[PDB]
């Protein structure tokens, strides 16, 4: 997705949140 860490940077369980500065 867009920005799935947007909204939520704590956690990335999802590809979707992977990229975003929570996980990366």
Do not use: F, H, I, Y
């Not at 704590?10 to 500065?21: E, F, G, H, I």
């Amino acid at each position: 997705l867009p920005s799935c860490c947007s909204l939520n940077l704590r956690l990335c369980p999802v590809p979707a949140c992977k990229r975003n500065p929570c996980c990366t």
